[PDB]
Amino acid sequence: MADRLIVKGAREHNLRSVDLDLPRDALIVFTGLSGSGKSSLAFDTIFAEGQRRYVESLSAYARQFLGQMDKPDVDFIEGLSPAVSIDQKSTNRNPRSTVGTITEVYDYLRLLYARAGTPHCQTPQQIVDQVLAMPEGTRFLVLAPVVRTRKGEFADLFDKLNAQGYSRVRVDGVVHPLTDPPKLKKQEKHDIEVVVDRLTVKAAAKRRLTDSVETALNLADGIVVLEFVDHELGAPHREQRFSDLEPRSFSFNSPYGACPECSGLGIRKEVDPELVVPDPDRTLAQGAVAPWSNGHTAEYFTRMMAGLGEALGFDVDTPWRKLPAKARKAILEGADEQVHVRYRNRYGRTRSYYADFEGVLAFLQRKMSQTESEQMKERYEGFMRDVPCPVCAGTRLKPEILAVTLAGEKSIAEVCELSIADCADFLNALTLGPREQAIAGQVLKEIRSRLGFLLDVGLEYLSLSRAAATLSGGEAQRIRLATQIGSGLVGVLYVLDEPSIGLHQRDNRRLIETLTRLRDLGNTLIVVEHDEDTIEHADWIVDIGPGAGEHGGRIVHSGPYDELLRNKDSITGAYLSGRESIEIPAIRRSVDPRRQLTVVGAREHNLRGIDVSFPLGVLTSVTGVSGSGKSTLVNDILAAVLANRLNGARQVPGRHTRVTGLDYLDKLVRVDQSPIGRTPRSNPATYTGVFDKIRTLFAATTEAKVRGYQPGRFSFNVKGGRCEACTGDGTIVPCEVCQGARYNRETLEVHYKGKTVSEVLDMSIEEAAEFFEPIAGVHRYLRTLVDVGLGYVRLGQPAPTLSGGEAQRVKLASELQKRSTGRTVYILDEPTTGLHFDDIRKLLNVINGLVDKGNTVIVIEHNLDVIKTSDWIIDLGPEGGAGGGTVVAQGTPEDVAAVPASYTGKFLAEVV
Amino acid sequence: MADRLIVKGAREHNLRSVDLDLPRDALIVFTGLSGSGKSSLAFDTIFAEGQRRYVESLSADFIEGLSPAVSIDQKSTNRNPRSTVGTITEVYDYLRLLYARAGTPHCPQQIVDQVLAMPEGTRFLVLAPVVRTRKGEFADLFDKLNAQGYSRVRVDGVVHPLTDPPKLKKQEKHDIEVVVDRLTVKAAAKRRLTDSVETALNLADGIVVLEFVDHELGAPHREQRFDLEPRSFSFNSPYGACPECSGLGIRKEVDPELVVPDPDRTLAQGAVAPWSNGHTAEYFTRMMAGLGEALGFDVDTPWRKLPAKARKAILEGADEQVHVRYRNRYGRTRSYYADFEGVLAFLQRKMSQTESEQMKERYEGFMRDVPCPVCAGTRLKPEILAVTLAGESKGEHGAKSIAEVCELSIADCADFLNALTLGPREQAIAGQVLKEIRSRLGFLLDVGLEYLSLSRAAATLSGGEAQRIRLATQIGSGLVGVLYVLDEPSIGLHQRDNRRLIETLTRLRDLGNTLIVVEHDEDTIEHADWIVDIGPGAGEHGGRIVHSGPYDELLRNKDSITGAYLSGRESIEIPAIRRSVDPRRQLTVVGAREHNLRGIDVSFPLGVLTSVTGVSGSGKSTLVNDILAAVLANRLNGARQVPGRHTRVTGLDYLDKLVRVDQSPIGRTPRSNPATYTGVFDKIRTLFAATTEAKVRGYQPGRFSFNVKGGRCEACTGDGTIKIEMNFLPDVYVPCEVCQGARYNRETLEVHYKGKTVSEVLDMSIEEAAEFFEPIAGVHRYLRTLVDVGLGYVRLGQPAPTLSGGEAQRVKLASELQKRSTGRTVYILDEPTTGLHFDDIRKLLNVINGLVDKGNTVIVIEHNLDVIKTSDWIIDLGPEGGAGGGTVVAQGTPEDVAAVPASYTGKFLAEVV
DNA sequence: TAGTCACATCAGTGATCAGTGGTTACCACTGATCACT
DNA sequence: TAGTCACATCAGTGATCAGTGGTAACCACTGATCACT
Ligand SMILES: [Zn+2]
Ligand SMILES: [Zn+2]
Ligand SMILES: [Zn+2]
Ligand SMILES: [Zn+2]
């Protein structure tokens, strides 16, 4: 029973000639940095090969014909197993797919509804047990409801029944002989339940009842009825069944049984109201409302909104706590009528937004119903407008079914008006008995399993009624884990992305135990977490990419982890034997009692309303369990407000009250995790805004001037500069004319500085550091890129060849020094995702140097030594989910270390 | 190379807890009786694991060590008119993709490359380009053009400077071809001419010419400009299919002269196929006799000696109407008051009026021909099919139109495609597609299917070529260490048709692939590596493993009854000279000239056990089944199929009835049992209706059947097992709370007929149940035939999928070989060895020998040497495969077929008798 | 040489019913050059 | 501290299309039970 997988000859981008063995019955982690080829091998060489080998076999069958659109490009892999990938799916929208559908509970709940369906208004053992329990000596009748709900005249049926000579019949409860049948009319209602026997419960009678029952068992296909006619215990005429009411068919996504407005799978319940202006303490003149803080529309709406504020009588800048909350209420409801208003924006245009709006609730509705921006007109509706379906309570059913279907089990709210935890604890709380709680089967266990898995991980705060667009990072990283785990199949290979996003270190302290449980089941697991806890648990650790470019396209470590300590070349080994991941004691006194930001009263769904004290001019780090409110406060609340009214962004402030130091702040830059590199059009030089300047500089040459070639003509995406032979991709075997250069001969003649654009792109940035030195902007971009230390990339490198995680690192290098004050706050993502701790320590050297220059960084982190190097740590929430949302420590890393409450400090205290 | 497949927790009905572990480097064969555990073993242990593997991963029991396998079961592919032979050979879509890759439809940079390649110093007037044609008034358009600045124009057929606009009207049509410059050819002037053309490429939408603008205009501008259409690529969609015939294959309905195969028979007897019906024979005889009396042409005279005028007049009929109305044999009268249009136009109305479209296949493809010629056998639009290949040089550099599947064979199409040249583009690399095609093409070539033209379809599909194509297609991948699970793809039919297809398995085994073979053919055995015999018994107690891999262990083993013939333990022989007189009673199919036949005469003796051998799928299966068996069926019982072409049949006065049986697998539905298929259960329920405790309720014996709502327990679906599960898993068979392995309901179980209840009588095998029901002969003969064929321990109440489709299937025929006890009623039998294991082969051979010695007549399609040497007269057809066959090479006794030196089975008899 | 013997089973002969069998996007985000101060 | 006092050159900044990213017959099958003589 060998436990080895073998991969040979893998080649993709910088990765080349990879021959590695993956052991089983143990966890194996690939380490490295974003762009070293580890992500390419983890994602698009092994899983892609397995998927292709699985799908390419068959296409005719219409169950797997939906496959084979995927087109992976891998050489070969032998001795593989069908693997499953676990990573976020960037669909860019999930309105039609609620959280219930992605967790596979919707179809199951529909089957559960269909199982025990009673609208209010089988076996031979079931045939016999009731007559066995029938009291003796009781007069009754045999009933055969064979023409159920088929009202109308049935004299032809009377003649037909007379042909078999049953001699008995019963209509609407009245009994008659077949020889003397009652009159029937087509217009009148006539439900036929023909009496087969006017019998009675006496001794040795069971054969006549058996005959009179099996007659309709073979005629009506297994349905009869018994009817007490002398005792009727239980009803005025007690009867027993041996099987606005419209049964028809059951459907959820069909127009026959769906709401005419919500159109199925759409619920406008959203996350929370009041979210447009939930701040009672901000400076209102600093754009409390998101449309009031746009790049150019900010003043465009502030003009008449300040006019209406002056008219009504509430101040333009005073916080809503010195004023009553009536100010917030009256900016929500506003007032009718319009006033004269017109102003110019920063962009130079002049728009006349002349309309009547009833507060921000109807002002935003007017924006949805009036604006030409088809994106924002639905972007702004979701976060802060709650208008669910009134005719169906937001649910996926016709008006006149939802009441009846639950009357016997009244109206339907369920998945569209409930929460995940409430539904989880309510579904199994109904011990109905005979129908669903009779046999073990799978119903109760399958209901319990996934919901309990969500409970132990911590997804109890989620709600199905909540819009799927409000999915937090923790929810995104945990729901996929739970859904992958629910199968629990033994021997299947799992490959996972970086899990530090959405989870804490203490959360990893249980994710690792979950992974070891999965291993104890008998499967194979692969993670790229890079945390030191996942390391040291691998029998054969492998590290790749000593250099992310051609200088380091070789295997750097593959062994039993014993040689990691002695080998400092490997980055993960260089972290442990650091000489660089030390406390590095800073001044830690650059904080100021007054020159400091505060946030209070943030009563978000992930928070409680605590006061976070952000210092200025420091490397302050916000930490805590993910999903406990740190991201909703630092990013959704703080970064949003200083972005929208300190640089000109558009994000909604969210549920909070106050941010201070408005006079002490000038600019803010936010860099997200942002895995965005997938399209060949996007390049490390095109979106950065440097390629257009490169074209301008190249057109500043004499030859480009004489040949009449402009910067726009000198791009590779517009039809002017791209030859039709390449079709724009450069290599198709490359273009015959271009000969592997991606430039037509009519444009390649521009040899500025002895080189062309293709020559500059081909040349590495490390050797191009001497280039672009005089000209300022490209010099700054290239110099900060080199300061990052990853100058292996080319300017026009396609995004499919860029590993996820490093897409925004290049911009983030230049996104850390503005106005040279340099206290301008920069919100940082986690460098742990992608880059390993040696790359993060080089980044830390950059951060420390420019913080000594005067810069300010607010960073959400996951590791230990990187934030131990910092000077201030703020922990928000010790426990995950609802057990957090409050600050538990704020100060020097050693100060929080001494406090045995914050696990961040506890981690900083066990290693000093 | 050593991927250990482990089977644990495997059991299904007859199968019971079979566990094993094996490496993965050789071929695995399942032997034993048909089904009896091996069919379920090849189903619920590997395919079930693959199912529970892929059905979780598709998104939008526990078995480990196996590889993703492919299914080549019977249902996966059968005869369908929608799919031609191209799709099933996966070369239709394949070759279509390669054609669409870099095809040339035949009839910026190249604009200046033409001048660059043109030797310097020439002279030609490159003055005026062509812009897109516009018509109407363009005063403001020309004003805007002047604002831009061009200084040139050419409208209304006259050239002007742009400053001079001529007269334009909205009612006047102009071919607007404005000028852009006044340049001319010069040395090293490209930088000029480019600036004249390239910018125009952004305004004229890629239109520019170098016209003469001179006086003589001898040539039309040297045809210089800078039928072809892109269209769309699709085969099933109507985007690029035959718009009239909906993209279906051409309905080749040859021959029109199939109306009268045998001319010597009188036309009144029903020589015309619709004229020999059970009820419509006289319905058509009335008009043809009326026409014979009216026109005066003779009828009872054979067609060959008849005048051609009579034949044509009865073929196309005549005009006008006559008063004819008669009754049939079954008591209904048909008042046919219309015109007798021969048998040409009546058929068209017949298939036009009918609703069922399956009974018209025989009456359409073999009566008269009405195909659509717009596509002429092409599943492509008329333009593209020629356009794509008009630039594709093929074979000896011929580029006219795509024929391939439509109009060529394997050999010529492959040879022509091996010389494809679309320019130097595709010569720079060969690619893996070349070897992907070449491996399976060469494997098909060495098999011996060069004659197999691409025009083949379901209309000309045989079982042997079906095995050929399925095996070639599943080998075409040519992987290493990948499981291929296949049930019996078709009947085993010849030793020369096979034993050449198996060489591909031996070649592919060197790679390291592995396959599961559920095949009863003797040729597949003795040339493999690992063989296991499953199912010494066939009932629910029949799930057992006996035989081990190596054939040496087969020699050692005795329970695996393949050794009964492998080591020659027993065999059956010719039943002496029997009742075979030479000259008198010997039917002769003379002048059989069908599609593959060649006007040959074959003598089948009467009152004998005769067999047919030779190159199979080459006109001998049609010889025994298509022409002969159809004739006996339609002129001896009342069948409704055309026979084909044969000049005369003799000796039919010495036959009374015919029974014909195909391969006919029992099925794959658990609701079907051998009781309900053979016909035992009908009279079983009839007898159950006569029981003292079962004749008190009015209802018919239909209550005593497990297929109707009456005696049916609603928890089991008539199976003894709650097989209810969602699509994510096929569940494991479990007993019912009512049955516990009885597949019945207790209420019916009160019928203890002679102390035996229904569940009990369906729970004991026919071996023990033979003692019961002895006094009544109706069930006694059936149980005797079951126990004689070799189905004694068979469970009567057992699902069809896990039972015998080779021996228990043919009991419905063998029990009726006592047809009116004469018993020379003629029988036509398929290849029985499929499903038939060797012990059951011997038992059935003894039964058939006894019945034929009773005085029967049996013609069987057979290939095994032992069974044909058991029969007394072997007819061998086919000097070669396909068109090379169709003629007798040796017909007579086995000694005679071994005597004439033209029969492949004759030299097969030479090495072993 | 012809009107006498009981309310029987054949064996399919050989269309129809009925299990199955498979089959088919409005937005919206980032992309992005030249739209602006 | 007086009206101009010489000379372009970075930054991420909206709106939106543009052009990479996600797609029931057929009735062909055969078996079951069966209508008929
Ligand atoms: Zn609705
Ligand atoms: Zn090119
Ligand atoms: Zn056609
Ligand atoms: Zn049961």
PDB file of C-alpha atoms in Angstrom, chain A residues 797-860:
ATOM      1  CA  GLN A 797       3.622  40.317 -18.146  1.00  0.00           C
ATOM      2  CA  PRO A 798       0.183  38.726 -18.710  1.00  0.00           C
ATOM      3  CA  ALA A 799      -1.965  38.199 -15.627  1.00  0.00           C
ATOM      4  CA  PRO A 800      -2.547  34.432 -16.187  1.00  0.00           C
ATOM      5  CA  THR A 801       1.194  33.981 -15.580  1.00  0.00           C
ATOM      6  CA  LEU A 802       1.104  36.160 -12.434  1.00  0.00           C
ATOM      7  CA  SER A 803       0.506  34.221  -9.226  1.00  0.00           C
ATOM      8  CA  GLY A 804      -2.443  35.419  -7.161  1.00  0.00           C
ATOM      9  CA  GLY A 805      -1.469  37.671  -4.272  1.00  0.00           C
ATOM     10  CA  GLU A 806       1.287  39.797  -5.810  1.00  0.00           C
ATOM     11  CA  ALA A 807      -1.004  41.677  -8.217  1.00  0.00           C
ATOM     12  CA  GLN A 808      -1.253  44.767  -5.985  1.00  0.00           C
ATOM     13  CA  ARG A 809       2.166  44.453  -4.316  1.00  0.00           C
ATOM     14  CA  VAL A 810       3.791  46.423  -7.144  1.00  0.00           C
ATOM     15  CA  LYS A 811       1.341  49.307  -6.705  1.00  0.00           C
ATOM     16  CA  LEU A 812       1.510  49.003  -2.910  1.00  0.00           C
ATOM     17  CA  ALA A 813       5.242  49.717  -3.162  1.00  0.00           C
ATOM     18  CA  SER A 814       4.432  53.176  -4.558  1.00  0.00           C
ATOM     19  CA  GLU A 815       1.315  53.413  -2.338  1.00  0.00           C
ATOM     20  CA  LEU A 816       3.302  54.110   0.837  1.00  0.00           C
ATOM     21  CA  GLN A 817       4.766  57.628   0.453  1.00  0.00           C
ATOM     22  CA  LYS A 818       2.468  60.555  -0.365  1.00  0.00           C
ATOM     23  CA  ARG A 819       3.179  64.216   0.522  1.00  0.00           C
ATOM     24  CA  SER A 820       6.267  63.023   2.497  1.00  0.00           C
ATOM     25  CA  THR A 821       4.554  64.143   5.710  1.00  0.00           C
ATOM     26  CA  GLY A 822       4.471  61.010   5.731  1.00  0.00           C
ATOM     27  CA  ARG A 823       1.803  60.265   8.338  1.00  0.00           C
ATOM     28  CA  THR A 824      -0.620  59.638   5.445  1.00  0.00           C
ATOM     29  CA  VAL A 825      -2.280  56.424   6.576  1.00  0.00           C
ATOM     30  CA  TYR A 826      -1.881  53.244   4.522  1.00  0.00           C
ATOM     31  CA  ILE A 827      -4.164  50.276   5.163  1.00  0.00           C
ATOM     32  CA  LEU A 828      -2.274  47.040   4.518  1.00  0.00           C
ATOM     33  CA  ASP A 829      -3.539  43.572   3.659  1.00  0.00           C
ATOM     34  CA  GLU A 830      -1.798  40.413   4.888  1.00  0.00           C
ATOM     35  CA  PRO A 831       1.585  39.796   3.202  1.00  0.00           C
ATOM     36  CA  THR A 832       1.388  36.284   4.679  1.00  0.00           C
ATOM     37  CA  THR A 833      -0.987  35.399   1.841  1.00  0.00           C
ATOM     38  CA  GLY A 834       1.542  34.710  -0.897  1.00  0.00           C
ATOM     39  CA  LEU A 835       4.869  36.102   0.299  1.00  0.00           C
ATOM     40  CA  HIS A 836       6.601  34.146   3.044  1.00  0.00           C
ATOM     41  CA  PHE A 837       8.083  35.692   6.172  1.00  0.00           C
ATOM     42  CA  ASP A 838      11.449  36.569   4.591  1.00  0.00           C
ATOM     43  CA  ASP A 839       9.702  38.512   1.831  1.00  0.00           C
ATOM     44  CA  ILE A 840       7.486  39.985   4.547  1.00  0.00           C
ATOM     45  CA  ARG A 841      10.609  40.935   6.521  1.00  0.00           C
ATOM     46  CA  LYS A 842      12.038  42.723   3.476  1.00  0.00           C
ATOM     47  CA  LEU A 843       8.680  44.491   3.251  1.00  0.00           C
ATOM     48  CA  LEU A 844       9.045  45.205   6.983  1.00  0.00           C
ATOM     49  CA  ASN A 845      12.447  46.779   6.368  1.00  0.00           C
ATOM     50  CA  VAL A 846      10.802  49.033   3.779  1.00  0.00           C
ATOM     51  CA  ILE A 847       7.958  49.862   6.189  1.00  0.00           C
ATOM     52  CA  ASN A 848      10.354  50.642   9.041  1.00  0.00           C
ATOM     53  CA  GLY A 849      12.578  52.823   6.867  1.00  0.00           C
ATOM     54  CA  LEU A 850       9.749  54.953   5.537  1.00  0.00           C
ATOM     55  CA  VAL A 851       8.025  55.016   8.946  1.00  0.00           C
ATOM     56  CA  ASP A 852      11.238  56.483  10.329  1.00  0.00           C
ATOM     57  CA  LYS A 853      10.770  58.841   7.392  1.00  0.00           C
ATOM     58  CA  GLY A 854       7.334  59.501   8.908  1.00  0.00           C
ATOM     59  CA  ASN A 855       4.806  57.137   7.340  1.00  0.00           C
ATOM     60  CA  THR A 856       1.835  55.473   9.054  1.00  0.00           C
ATOM     61  CA  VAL A 857       0.555  51.940   8.415  1.00  0.00           C
ATOM     62  CA  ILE A 858      -2.558  50.195   9.760  1.00  0.00           C
ATOM     63  CA  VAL A 859      -2.192  46.483   9.001  1.00  0.00           C
ATOM     64  CA  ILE A 860      -4.311  43.392   9.622  1.00  0.00           C
TER      65      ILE A 860
END
